[PDB]
Amino acid sequence: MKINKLNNASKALSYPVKKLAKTEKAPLTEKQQRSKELKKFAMSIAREVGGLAPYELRATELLRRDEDKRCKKFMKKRLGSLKMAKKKIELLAEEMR
Amino acid sequence: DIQLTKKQLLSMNPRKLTNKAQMDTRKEVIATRKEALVNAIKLPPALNQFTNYLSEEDLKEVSDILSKFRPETRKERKQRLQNERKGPKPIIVKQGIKHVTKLIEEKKAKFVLIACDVDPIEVVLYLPTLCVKMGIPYALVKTKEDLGKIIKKKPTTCLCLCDVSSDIKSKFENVIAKCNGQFKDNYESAMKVWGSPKE
Amino acid sequence: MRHSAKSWGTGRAMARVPRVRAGGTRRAGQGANANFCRGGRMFAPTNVNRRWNRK
Amino acid sequence: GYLQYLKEIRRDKQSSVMRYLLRVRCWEYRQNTAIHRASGPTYLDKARMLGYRNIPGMCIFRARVRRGARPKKVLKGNTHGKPSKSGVYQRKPAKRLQAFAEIRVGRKCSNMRVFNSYWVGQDRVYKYFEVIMVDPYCDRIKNDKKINWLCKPVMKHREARGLTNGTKTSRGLGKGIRYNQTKGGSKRAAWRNRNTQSLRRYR
RNA sequence: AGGCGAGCGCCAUGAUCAUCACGACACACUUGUUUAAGGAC
RNA sequence: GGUAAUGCACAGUGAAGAGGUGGCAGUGUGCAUCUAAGACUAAAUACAACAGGAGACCGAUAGCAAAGAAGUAGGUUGACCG
RNA sequence: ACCACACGUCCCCGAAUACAGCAUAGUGCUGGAGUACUCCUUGGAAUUAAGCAUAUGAGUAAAGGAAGGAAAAGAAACUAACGAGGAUUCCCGUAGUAGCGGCGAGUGAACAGGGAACAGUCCAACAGUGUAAUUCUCAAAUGAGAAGUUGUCAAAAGGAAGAA
Ligand SMILES: [K+]
Ligand SMILES: [K+]
Ligand SMILES: [K+]
Ligand SMILES: [K+]
Ligand SMILES: [K+]
Ligand SMILES: [K+]
Ligand SMILES: [K+]
Ligand SMILES: [K+]
Ligand SMILES: [K+]
Ligand SMILES: [K+]
Ligand SMILES: [K+]
Ligand SMILES: [K+]
Ligand SMILES: [K+]
Ligand SMILES: [K+]
Ligand SMILES: [K+]
Ligand SMILES: [K+]
Ligand SMILES: [K+]
Ligand SMILES: [K+]
Ligand SMILES: [K+]
Ligand SMILES: [Mg+2]
Ligand SMILES: [Mg+2]
Ligand SMILES: [Mg+2]
Ligand SMILES: [Mg+2]
Ligand SMILES: [Mg+2]
Ligand SMILES: [Mg+2]
Ligand SMILES: [Mg+2]
Ligand SMILES: [Mg+2]
Ligand SMILES: [Mg+2]
Ligand SMILES: [Mg+2]
Ligand SMILES: [Mg+2]
Ligand SMILES: [Mg+2]
Ligand SMILES: [Mg+2]
């Protein structure tokens, strides 16, 4: 059997290359900026025209009573992900302020 | 053959009309019963807006201004292109939802008309809120056909105007003041009242 | 193996070979599928999977 | 532009305006016959993502499907076999409910090709869909440069062979280790490649 | 924000969200009472 | 094969514009790699009817059921059988 | 005379239709046959476990739908942790392995490494506003009308080779 002869320490070694730095892409052109602005704008109009959904109302009500941990549990069960819940709570909080 | 009365049409069950011969009647039963349902239930504030429109008198006043900026026909267009370029840039009234929304967004548009009887409505639903945010005056008209007649062609959803000839300026300003009264000035109050069932 | 055949079983004073189901012809009641039968299948039929070449 | 505003509103399915419209439309769809022709698309943005234009030789049809799982077709629950295969209820179909709509529209509109389909509503009993159809024997279409491909003879009955957006999803196709069951083209193509004995000349 | 027994639990009533019967209308749904009858059952 | 879910469905519930994955459940945090929910695509691969060429194959109880007017003579109420 | 190549003629029943469903400005299209090979559904039991109920045979048989000379697939919400590679399909191989399993009987893949053949592109998001510039019909040598603003319209002839 030609397997499992080296230790983990010696398997971790590596050859000394010379690396190339990554080309950063930070510049964003004028036309790309206007494009992003118009999309964010459109998102405002929808919220203005049609308002909040039932679970969003129930959530925001709990935030007024400082029921932070109840709101957390509630949102987790509605959206599934604990990450989506943490994000949606932060967006709702900012809307109320 | 015989025209059925309103009472009859409201009585019939559409799901029991089944033969190929009966299809036109099935269509009429559905049309009349839908009307009764929509009158019975409350409208959200944004949909309730399109219940308020200009009188036939105001429509006349507005049309009697706007008609002087009619678009070119194909016959006219051909002649123009055989001749050379001459004179100043014309003023023309503009048409179609795609162009109008662009001109509102670019803050070029100066006054806008919108039609009410449009199906599905989601095409025009957002226009008043956008007009209020850009600060452009507007007015609502009953039918798509009312607009078609202004520009002497097929019905449309909306019309727009981006310029004013000095000749017309006095009348123009008065019209805008009438419109602001019925429409733009009233907006913030309107967005909070639900449409009542109709008596 | 083409034909419809079945055994008659014991009690008929005959050997229990499968026999051909038919009527109107001399072929009725004859002995069908086995290697010891006329028109039956050969023992261990020759087959393409045999190893033809050699290393 | 205009199509962006429509997208944002169509996504808010529990806004007051969308609850209103879903209720009134789902009422009307159920008063009509089970497959019927529409006047135009209900949602302009969605139809245009999927390839609709308002030219001669394209149409929208609308179809309804009954909801829930599909029971085993046996009398009195008697299955004539082993007990692990005796269940009748709680058996779920392999294809989406959408796939049934596409298959039935294609039978009725036999002179036309099924392009794509989308959701338009639901209630307690039915689910409702719009299907985009094209006519390959039409002069307008034969000379188009974007949908002229649908006239190739291989494009007959895409829906019956699991090739449309609604019918494709039950096949299990994809890229990576999570889809090893379909390496080769399909489940049956993988099966053949795994259950074959190879017998070389020199061996 | 009131009252009782050597701030405690117990007794008063005042604001905040669901919510179970009962009424009275008509719009879903039901029935050849059908230019009609029921009715959120 | 997919093991505290590999893929596919049905009912409830239901996102974000930024998200998905790194074969063992969870929470946090850097790092690497990609961009779903719209479409098209040649060549290299598979195998009947019908035609052509070959063979350490069979030689009229064999070889296809059938080397002649063979799916024929003939048979089943019938499906079918020969 | 006779033969070989093509054409003309081609009774009645049969999808069998003076019909059904459906599209266009209009002309029209589908239906039945075939289905070895390819794609999509539905879905057994004999048998093995020396009994048998989970499991096996097997996502196989049977029954339905559909297409072509092939069909399906296909240009990473992909692998990998190397000093990394780079669409799909096929062959050699990893491998009767990692694992699944009354952990019994039995089942069972992937990347690498060596090759055959090689090719990349479209729609939406996002079309001239000093004029729908776009498609179709009839006339005419320059007019009438239909579709369409709930959005139309984003360019080349051309050739000698190769094979039967
Ligand atoms: K047999
Ligand atoms: K939203
Ligand atoms: K049309
Ligand atoms: K199944
Ligand atoms: K194998
Ligand atoms: K009543
Ligand atoms: K009534
Ligand atoms: K009454
Ligand atoms: K793709
Ligand atoms: K014989
Ligand atoms: K015969
Ligand atoms: K067929
Ligand atoms: K056994
Ligand atoms: K035994
Ligand atoms: K079998
Ligand atoms: K293909
Ligand atoms: K394809
Ligand atoms: K690959
Ligand atoms: K290679
Ligand atoms: Mg080790
Ligand atoms: Mg290393
Ligand atoms: Mg023999
Ligand atoms: Mg899915
Ligand atoms: Mg896993
Ligand atoms: Mg001899
Ligand atoms: Mg013989
Ligand atoms: Mg007899
Ligand atoms: Mg037994
Ligand atoms: Mg099994
Ligand atoms: Mg298996
Ligand atoms: Mg079969
Ligand atoms: Mg584009």
DSSP string of A4-69, one letter each residue: S-S-HHHHT-----------------HHHHHHHHHHHHHHHHHHHHH---HHHHHHHHHHHTT-HH
Are D17 and A49 in contact, with CB atoms under 8 Å apart?
Answer: yes
Question: Which technique was the structure solved with, according to the deposited record?
Answer: cryo-EM
Count of beta carbons in the 10 Å neighbourhood of residue B22: 13
User: DSSP per residue over chain D, as a string?
Assistant: -HHHHHHHHHH-TTSHHHHHHHHHHHHHHHHS-SEEE-SS-S-HHHHHHTT--SSTTEEEEEEEEE-S------STT--SS-GGG---SS---SS-HHHHHHHHHHHHSTTSEEEEEEEEEE-SSEEEEEEEEE-TT-HHHHT-SSSGGGGSGGGTTTGGGT-STTTGGGS---SSGGGGGGTTSSHHHHHHHHS-----S--
Are D117 and D165 in contact, with CB atoms under 8 Å apart?
Answer: yes
Are D63 and D119 in contact, with CB atoms under 8 Å apart?
Answer: no
Picking from B122, B156, B160, B191 by the largest number of D CB atoms within 10 A of its own CB, the best residue to mutate is: B122
> Within 7 Å: CB of D171 and strand E?
no
CA angle, D171 as apex, D170 and D177 as ends, to 5°? Answer: 115
Nearest alpha carbon to residue D21 among B75, B87, A49, B20: A49
Q: Which residue of A has its CA nearest to D1?
A: A38
Pairwise CA distance, residues B113 & B104, whole Å: 12
Distances (CA, A) of B186 to B178, B195, C16, C18, C54: 12, 16, 104, 99, 99
Pairwise CA distance, residues D151 & D141, whole Å: 9
**Cβ-Cβ contacts under 8 Å for A70 (sequence gap 6 or more):** A62
Pairwise CA distance, residues A39 & D72, whole Å: 50
Q: Which bases of chain E are contacted by protein, using any atom under 7 A from a CB?
A: 26-29, 31, 34-36
Nearest alpha carbon to residue D130 among D195, D3, D12, D42: D42
Count of beta carbons in the 10 Å neighbourhood of residue B145: 13
Pairwise CA distance, residues D100 & D82, whole Å: 31
Count of beta carbons in the 10 Å neighbourhood of residue B129: 19
- The kind and range of the H/E element at C7 are strand C5-7
D chain contacts of residue C55, beta-carbon cutoff 8 Å = 202
Helix (H, G, I), strand (E, B) or coil at C46: coil
Are B110 and B163 in contact, with CB atoms under 8 Å apart?
Answer: yes
Nearest alpha carbon to residue D67 among D129, D115, D113, D23: D129
Pairwise CA distance, residues D117 & D129, whole Å: 7
> Phi and psi at residue A90, in whole multiples of 5°?
-70, -40
Ligand nearest to C-alpha D59: 3
Pairwise CA distance, residues D5 & C13, whole Å: 93
Q: Is the CB of residue A38 less than 8 Å away from at least one CB of chain B?
A: yes
Q: Is the CB of residue D16 less than 8 Å away from at least one CB of chain A?
A: yes
Query: What's the CA D51/C1' G139 distance, rounded, in angstroms?
Result: 37
Three-state SS string across chain B, please?
Answer: CCCCCHHHHHHCCHHHCCCHHHHHHHHHHHHHHHHHHHCCCCECHHHHHHHCCCCHHHHHHHHHHHHHHCCCCHHHHHHHHHCCCCCCCCCCCEECHHHHHHHHHCCCCCEEEEECCCCCHHHCCCHHHHHHHHCCCEEEECCHHHHHHHCCCCCCCEEEECCCCHHHHHHHHHHHHHHHHHCHHHHHHHCCCCECCCC
Nearest alpha carbon to residue B198 among B41, B10, B32: B41
A chain contacts of residue B125, beta-carbon cutoff 8 Å = 49
Nearest alpha carbon to residue B100 among B130, B144, B64, B59: B130
Give me the resolution in angstroms, 1 decimal.
Answer: 2.8
Nearest alpha carbon to residue D120 among D15, D1, D55, D24: D24
Helix (H, G, I), strand (E, B) or coil at C25: coil
**Cβ-Cβ contacts under 8 Å for D150 (sequence gap 6 or more):** D113, D115, D134, D136, D141
Determine the distance separating the centroid of ligand 6 and the alpha carbon of D194, expressed in angstroms.
71
Are D133 and D155 in contact, with CB atoms under 8 Å apart?
Answer: no
Interface touch A39/D4, C-beta < 8 Å: yes
B111-115 and B138-141 strand pairing: parallel
Interface touch D16/B30, C-beta < 8 Å: no
Query: What's the CA B44/C1' F18 distance, rounded, in angstroms?
Result: 32
Query: What's the CA D106/C1' E28 distance, rounded, in angstroms?
Result: 33
Pairwise CA distance, residues D129 & D75, whole Å: 33
Pairwise CA distance, residues D156 & D150, whole Å: 8
With both helix axes pointing from N to C terminus, report the angle between A30-50 and D2-11 in degrees, rounded to the nearest 10: 50
> Within 7 Å: CB of D172 and strand F?
yes
